[PDB]
Write a protein that binds this ligand. Structure first.
Ligand code: FMN
Ligand code: ILB
Ligand code: ORO
Length: 364
């Protein structure tokens, strides 16, 4: 329980929990427990990384989606994450798609979800983050940054304005903002990844960002999908360097269904995450890193469940990594596991630290 044993959670607790609660109910309880600190390894200098104008004591963060409304930020740092990202958050509140909208594929160590941006909205999250704004300031100074993921409302008419509003309301409370334009569960959202659309969108976002006071000015990253054509990637890389985008989050869930999936629910509509997404995600990181000449910070996400998974993404070009689906299968202990294996792998491979491994595959 509080001891935090990897086998117990993986073999007994998590399985029992999922055998009694449906996916969504399990998630809601997860958020509750985390917010209350009902949770079960010391970071070494080796895991420290410096990017996006911040210090990160460890490169392992919790991907967007687990804490959509910023209700468990502190319980997440306590879980061992080097940084937390909340969202996606939409300007106005919205319920998202009807239940069921999340599905487990245990035989594939994967999950499929079609939430549709269920969100409390900017205001609610704004006040929720303001209530701990000073505490976060100290956490960030301590190497524990906060990122905020921005989405857009379903009935919105001006996609750009939606993100612009998010930048104005939550940008002052975040170390970095994420323009999420890769969600597969919102009609026409991914089309915003197009060159022309993306350029107009990011130009406005960055302008709103630059208009904020210095200490409240966040880095701006763009979260992309793993289903982009070689053309989309070239365009995104071009726009990113043209506008000075601070970084990229690679990748979101995939609408593809790799041959081999065994889960009974493999044909449910939605974005696929977990092991089946891992390598497709690592390859997207490898490609974007090269297209940006390794000058644009990348946060690798997609099927990370071990130190090896984390290091392959770092060697492919990621400065930081995130995980989510792995947490839903192995529980809280997975965080320490990934960090411990990552450290051992770095030493075992001759790297003085994480910073030394970033992009290493491209130099060999
Ligand atoms: C239930 C669920 C909800 C998610 N919600 C969001 C979201 O609101 N915004 C976002 O940018 N990504 C969201 N994601 C995507 C994750 O942040 C991540 O990009 C993806 O799942 C790959 O990581 P993983 O294999 O470790 O889960 C969600 C994923 C899941 C499984
Ligand atoms: O589970 C799923 O299918 C899905 C999601 C999910 O949110 N899972 C999930 C869960 F159920 C439980 C904990 C958890 C959190 C803290 C302590 C803990 O330990 C003890 F309970 F002991 F406190 C256990 C973490 C999780 F990540 C997202 C959609 C699919
Ligand atoms: O809320 C969602 O449907 C959602 C958003 C996103 O960016 N990715 C995902 O897999 N689901």
């Amino acid at each position: 329980m509080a001891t935090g044993d990897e086998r117990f959670y993986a073999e007994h607790l998590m399985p029992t929990l999922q055998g009694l609660l449906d996916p969504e109910s399990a998630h809601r309880l997860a958020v509750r427990f985390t917010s209350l600190g009902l949770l079960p390894f010391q970071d070494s200098d080796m895991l420290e990384v410096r990017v996006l104008g911040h210090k990160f004591r460890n490169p392992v963060g919790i991907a967007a989606g687990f804490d959509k409304h910023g209700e468990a930020v502190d319980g997440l740092y306590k879980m061992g994450f080097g940084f937390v990202e909340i969202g996606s958050v939409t300007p106005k509140p919205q319920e998202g798609n009807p239940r069921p909208r999340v599905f487990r594929l245990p035989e594939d160590q994967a999950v499929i979800n079609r939430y549709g941006f269920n969100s409390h909205g900017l205001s609610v999250v704004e006040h929720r983050l303001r209530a701990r704004q000073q505490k976060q300031a100290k956490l960030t100074e301590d190497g524990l940054p906060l990122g905020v993921n921005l989405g857009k409302n379903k009935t919105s008419v001006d996609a750009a304005e939606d993100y612009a509003e998010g930048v104005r309301v939550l940008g002052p409370l975040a170390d970095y903002l994420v323009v999420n334009v890769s969600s597969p569960n919102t009609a026409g959202l991914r089309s915003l990844q197009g060159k022309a659309e993306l350029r107009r969108l990011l130009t406005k976002v960055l302008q709103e960002r630059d208009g904020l006071r210095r200490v409240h000015r966040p880095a701006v990253l763009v979260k992309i999908a793993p289903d982009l054509t070689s053309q989309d990637k070239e365009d995104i890389a071009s726009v990113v360097k043209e506008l000075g985008i601070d970084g990229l989050i690679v990748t979101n869930t995939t609408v593809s269904r790799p041959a081999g999936l065994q889960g009974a629910l493999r044909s449910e509509t939605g974005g696929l995450s977990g092991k089946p997404l891992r390598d497709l995600s690592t390859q997207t990181i490898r490609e974007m890193y090269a297209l940006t000449q390794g000058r644009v910070p990348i946060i690798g996400v997609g099927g990370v469940s071990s130190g090896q998974d984390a290091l392959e993404k770092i060697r492919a070009g990621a400065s930081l990594v995130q995980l989510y689906t792995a947490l839903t299968f192995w529980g809280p202990p997975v965080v320490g596991k990934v960090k411990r294996e990552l450290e051992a792998l770095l030493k075992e491979q001759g790297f003085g630290g994480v910073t030394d491994a970033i992009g290493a595959d491209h130099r060999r």
